[PDB]
């Protein structure tokens, strides 16, 4: 019953590996659906082709910005942004897919994949999913994101979609 989407990661055009995620619809539907709906690109916009503009080693990997690709843009399927459905799920560790907001009730299309346990984000960011397969792919994306976050090389979402 829980949706499974994926990202085919490419480092500078050359494919690296696939990374699938489990969307916890059974807890946070609207957030869950928006990422599934945007991972498939059914409205005409989404993750295919967008990159991870912000990767901070030992912390997380941020992407989802298909409009301004510099951490400014991106939008939800509901128009601009949306509310904070809930805060039931916590950032328990690496693999956690959560929404990258700009303060409360500002969820759009940006998200981040955790590459370590980030409990200080608990209550401030809506956790809505988790990496099912390919967590070694995000582990590699690592060396390509600096301390400040600027990538050394372009990490891009070559292909993405829904598998179940």
């Amino acid at each position: 019953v829980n949706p499974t989407v994926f990202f085919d990661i490419a480092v500078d055009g050359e494919p690296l590996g696939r990374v699938s995620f489990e969307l916890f619809a059974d807890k946070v539907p609207k957030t869950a659906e928006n990422f599934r709906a945007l991972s498939t690109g059914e409205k005409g916009f989404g993750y295919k082709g967008s990159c991870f503009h912000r990767i901070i080693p030992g912390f997380m990997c941020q992407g989802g910005d298909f409009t301004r690709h510099n951490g400014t843009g991106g939008k939800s399927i509901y128009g601009e942004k949306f509310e904070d459905e809930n805060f039931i799920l916590k950032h328990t560790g690496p693999g956690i897919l959560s929404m990258a907001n700009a303060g409360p009730n500002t969820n759009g299309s940006q998200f981040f994949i955790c590459t370590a346990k980030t409990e200080w984000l608990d209550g401030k960011h809506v956790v809505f999913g988790k990496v099912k397969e390919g967590m070694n792919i995000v582990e590699a994306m690592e060396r390509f994101g600096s301390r400040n976050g600027k990538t050394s090389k372009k990490i891009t979402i070559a292909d993405c979609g829904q598998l179940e």
Partner: peptide
């Protein structure tokens, strides 16, 4: 402006 801090 979207994003979480370390």
């Amino acid at each position: 402006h979207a994003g979480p801090i370390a």
